[PDB]
Symmetry: D3
């Protein structure tokens, strides 16, 4: 269809925030491989496991694919919420990334 | 009633973004006449046609009046959407302004 | 549960905006006592009356307690709205604080 | 020259913030006439006195003209500061507007 | 050294804004190939020419490489400015991209 | 003097960001005691050590007091920088907090 730049600005800002937090983690005790390609951010942990954060423009969503599964987030009333459970994006990502890093990594707005 | 400054801040920011993009277009190949008076932004293209972007505070809306018609936008879940079709504001305005300028003008958040 | 940092960032920003406006009022003709403790902002007016603005994280709300009563606000479609009447936050607070100060204090996004 | 949209976005946001605060004041005890024309905001107080807030793009400035005089503000290190005294914009405007309204009006970021 | 997330948030936001504007241009009369890889945004115009916008973290800069040359921008007093001429980022990019597209493309904050 | 609300909005936003990150850390493996009183944020780690982040309005600064010492930050060209070394705020705080928690805590804009 037509690009929705209001959606893209918000969704791209999520990818960027995630990348900055990983950069900080990598300054310290972490070694997470990070790749940003198009609208896809791929994190590869030291144990070889992965988390991908990406855009789904057709539903104006941001998605996570992690060891725990695949989760979809829509921006509703000021924040990104899991379309099934309502769980807020950064809290879920923190949970999944901490599981996979074996060392806390704290994502926060 | 009482002024809703949260609405006004968002709606005024739309008018301002539209004006900046037109200013840039006017630095280049365009000659669009721009007038900002109160909460009304009037664009007059070289062919004499017009687009008006204005506020409708009673419904917390931003409106377009263009050759294509009159469209009303409400801020829902992080963006300005056409109250009838759901089309996002800047994508619609891009379409209408490009029709009337005869040369692409690209509005974007 | 888990801290919702997207909610907290927005709600904390309300407390901060309220405090800045009171600081400005206090530079001039006002003498409002202000206390910020945790997620609770307490305003004590010259006549001894009070307004408290605080967070209610379980419902992702910001609350007012004032002479006029207790009001609850949720962030819906870009702004903080009274969960019962729909009244926008800063307009309501302006009303209540002006009643209690006996001199206009203007809160605005 | 060429329009500086980064400057214009910041400077226009000042005009908009000033207008919202006046709108709130006008909901209450004030009757300030407000006119926004192009990049010029004219406030006319009940006593007939005036304050104008406007843009000066050639120096990327925002200016005040008030009873107290004419003051020029540049954005330096995160805020708008008087080019002669360093006084921050909203604090100065609060001072001047309160003088002219005869009733406190509190401008705040 | 250590990742500067305040710099990265601002610089990444430039890349994202540029990409959104190109997306809009591509909805209309343009066909610009866009690739985002790491902190590098590559635009390939219909005539085969290129513009790259990328990060230079060691000096907290954003760079352009275009037909017109290589330009470096630092964030100073609220905006991205050419380190040699002071020209603001989006105005320069508009100039270079319009040269290379042969059809106006308007970048704006 | 007069309250500088442009400074206060930026400085308060630092305190709020720090608090949100600690809240997230506390959802996981951490137990950091957090107290926000006025413009002072006190963090008490499990080993009894402390970090305080607070405002210094007279110089428009944000300060850290940590085991490593006392550091002062001013907002210059888009970010908070150590007035002696130029080190950016969140990178320094990450370093100090990680030292004192004994488990990485990642602060990021
Ligand atoms: Na919303
Ligand atoms: Na700055």
């Amino acid at each position: 269809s037509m690009s929705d730049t209001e959606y893209l600005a918000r969704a791209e800002a999520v990818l960027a925030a995630v990348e900055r937090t990983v950069d900080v983690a990598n300054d310290g005790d972490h070694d997470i491989d990070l790749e940003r390609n198009g609208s896809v951010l791929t994190l590869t942990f030291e144990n070889g496991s992965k988390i991908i954060v990406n855009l789904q423009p057709p539903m104006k969503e941001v998605w996570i694919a992690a060891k725990a599964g695949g989760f979809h987030y829509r921006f509703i009333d000021g924040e990104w919420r899991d379309t099934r459970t309502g769980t807020e994006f950064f809290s879920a990502l923190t949970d999944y990334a901490t599981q996979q890093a074996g060392l806390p990594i704290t994502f926060s707005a």
